[PDB]
Design an enzyme around this catalytic site. Structure first.
Site: not given
Ligand SMILES: O=C(Nc1ccc2[nH]ccc2c1)c1cc(F)cc(N2CCOCC2)c1
Length: 351
Positions: A31-32, A50, A34, A165, A27-28
């Site tokens: 750098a941090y 992820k 997949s 995020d 899906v995407g």
């Molecule tokens: O959304 C985040 N991680 C994320 C994104 C996509 C993903 N797909 C599978 C796992 C996964 C994890 C995420 C990470 C953070 F470090 C903080 C916050 N927060 C959100 C709320 O506000 C404070 C910051 C959200």
């Protein structure tokens, strides 16, 4: 108790995941990490998995990995991303090198909502209500998002919203440069490094997002940092002596005083045809002095949200211990802290 894992190569990347996760589909990536879509056969949920990329290659990276896991394990609110699962194929700390995070599969973000559909005032009320409900929650834990923007807000077919995020990018100087959405929602004080910032940086962002829901257009689409500041000050007015005092930076303060003074504009003449209550709330969010901005909790009790506001269903967060943020540890110490958090994870209830 340890599930069985299977291996799979997807886009030059090895995925080792529990059998419960099936139909993995890229899906995407960044750098941090997949990301794959999958079906969780245990819960019946469509999920995003992820895989973190090189989670312990530096001190900075290892601390980052720990930070994300700590935040994700903490957040338990209807309007914020929830951690469904975290796992590693590693059988011991010694072989621990990969971390996978699982959450609900998003679908649409607010960016494709606003670009692709017509929003009534009732939709704006409901969408902003839910962002503020989530923000009340995270802010109650002294967690600041700092990068609220439409691409970080997931929205389902029923208009239900969650804050996340995605930032797989490192947030460098270059990606904040020029005509980029990456900077259009940022509070002026963080965009220009005016001062120590507070949680109402996130309220500025909400104001920018709300404006865009009402008009369908970016509020401050600056072609660079300075052009964007000029768009801002034209709306909200140039600062007075009281705010200038608070700008710690001397050069930043001297630049602002070089600008021709401008008064705050009439928001009813900017947001033509908008609910007066929406305009009033925007005036309380888009305030240059962050000390004077409305907070999430105050905004939830604003008359604009009378239809949705329920003070018995706007919960706050359990205390969040962030002392680790001031702590300097070695890679292996950050790694061992992270491993403990992986092993101790307890899944949320089914329904
Ligand atoms: O959304 C985040 N991680 C994320 C994104 C996509 C993903 N797909 C599978 C796992 C996964 C994890 C995420 C990470 C953070 F470090 C903080 C916050 N927060 C959100 C709320 O506000 C404070 C910051 C959200």
């Amino acid at each position: 108790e340890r599930p069985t894992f299977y291996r799979q190569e997807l886009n030059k990347t090895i995925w080792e995941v529990p059998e419960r996760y099936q139909n993995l589909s890229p899906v995407g990536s960044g750098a941090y990490g997949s990301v794959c879509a999958a079906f969780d056969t245990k819960t019946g949920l469509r999920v995003a998995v992820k895989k973190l990329s090189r989670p312990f290659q530096s001190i900075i990276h290892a601390k980052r990995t720990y930070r994300e896991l700590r935040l994700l394990k903490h957040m338990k609110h209807e309007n914020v991303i929830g951690l469904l699962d975290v796992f590693t194929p590693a059988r011991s700390l010694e072989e621990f090198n990969d971390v996978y995070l699982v959450t609900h599969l998003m679908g649409a973000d607010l960016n494709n909502i606003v670009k692709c559909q017509k929003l009534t005032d009732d939709h704006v009320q409901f969408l902003i209500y839910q962002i503020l409900r989530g923000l009340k929650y995270i802010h109650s834990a002294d967690i600041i998002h700092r990068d609220l923007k439409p691409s970080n807000l997931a929205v389902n077919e029923d208009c239900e919203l969650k804050i996340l995020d995605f930032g797989l990018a490192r947030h460098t100087d270059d990606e904040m440069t020029g005509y980029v959405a990456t900077r259009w929602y940022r509070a002026p004080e963080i965009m220009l490094n005016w001062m120590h910032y507070n949680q109402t940086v996130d309220i500025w962002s909400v104001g920018c997002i709300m404006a865009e829901l009402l008009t369908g257009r970016t509020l401050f689409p600056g072609t660079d940092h300075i052009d964007q500041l000029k768009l801002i000050l034209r709306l909200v007015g140039t600062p007075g002596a009281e705010l200038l005092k608070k700008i710690s930076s001397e050069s930043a303060r001297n630049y602002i005083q070089s600008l021709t003074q401008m008064p705050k504009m009439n928001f009813a003449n900017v947001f033509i045809g908008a609910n007066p209550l929406a305009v009033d709330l925007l005036e309380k969010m888009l305030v240059l002095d962050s000390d004077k901005r409305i907070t999430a909790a105050q905004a939830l009790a604003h008359a604009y949200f009378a239809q949705y506001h329920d003070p018995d269903d706007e919960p706050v967060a359990d205390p969040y211990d962030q002392s680790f943020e001031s702590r300097d540890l070695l890679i292996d110490e950050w790694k061992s802290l992270t491993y403990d958090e992986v092993i101790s994870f307890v899944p949320p209830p089914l329904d």
